[PDB]
Amino acid sequence: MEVILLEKVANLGNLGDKVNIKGGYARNFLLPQGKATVATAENVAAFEARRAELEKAAAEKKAAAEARAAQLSELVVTLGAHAGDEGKLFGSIGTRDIAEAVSAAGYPLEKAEVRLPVAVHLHTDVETTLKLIIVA
RNA sequence: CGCUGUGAAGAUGCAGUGUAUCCGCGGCUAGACGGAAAGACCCCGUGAACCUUUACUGUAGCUUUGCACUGGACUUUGAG
Numbered sequence A: 001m002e003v004i005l006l007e008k009v010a011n012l013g014n015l016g017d018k019v020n021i022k023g024g025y026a027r028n029f030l031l032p033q034g035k036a037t038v039a040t041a042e043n044v045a046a047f048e049a050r051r052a053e054l055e056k057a058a059a060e061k062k063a064a065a066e067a068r069a070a071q072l073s074e075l076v077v078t079l080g081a082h083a084g085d086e087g088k089l090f091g092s093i094g095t096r097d098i099a100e101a102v103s104a105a106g107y108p109l110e111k112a113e114v115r116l117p118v119a120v121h122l123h124t125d126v127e128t129t130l131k132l133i134i135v136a
Numbered sequence B: 001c002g003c004u005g006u007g008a009a010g011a012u013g014c015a016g017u018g019u020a021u022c023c024g025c026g027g028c029u030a031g032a033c034g035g036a037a038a039g040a041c042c043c044c045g046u047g048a049a050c051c052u053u054u055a056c057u058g059u060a061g062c063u064u065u066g067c068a069c070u071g072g073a074c075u076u077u078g079a080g
């Protein structure tokens, strides 16, 4: 399945390269979310008609990513929820309700890639090692 | 009608012979191979059915792997 990219993917992302991928990589991940588009012999024609105005935007969203990742890299924001122990609380210490904790002291910081299986991820080449402290 | 023979081989009907007027009624069941059911036993039909199994050939189901749905990455794995 020949597709051309819109955003850059981690392994094969050249943002417009003729990439041959399994049919399940597209149709289930890339096309629905939006990270690429099928080459229909005209999408590539219309990609150059929009590449000039899109790669500058892609840098701009990337530029805002590092600015936001570095602006709020020194917060020690603490929750006021009831807890039983530092690590074993009455609720759940996870990326489910901390959105309002960081939004009240700066950027909203919508939680989509705050990895915690506190390194928050926001772009392919941008990642911040935030540290969360909770009083218990 | 009986008897003795004969006879598809156990006779009311054939032969010989004996007995015996015609016709009921109440009884009895020895025979009419008495009535009833195209013997069920037995054998046969290149008949049926249902049942069994390590009869044959199949098959539901269960199970194995290939391919599709079906993808990313990292690692132990041959030749270019």
Ligand SMILES: [Mg+2]
Pocket (backbone or CB within 6 Å): none
């Ligand atoms: Mg006689």
Ligand SMILES: [Mg+2]
Pocket (backbone or CB within 6 Å): B028
């Ligand atoms: Mg009587």
Ligand SMILES: [Mg+2]
Pocket (backbone or CB within 6 Å): none
């Ligand atoms: Mg009779």
Ligand SMILES: [Mg+2]
Pocket (backbone or CB within 6 Å): B038
């Ligand atoms: Mg008969």
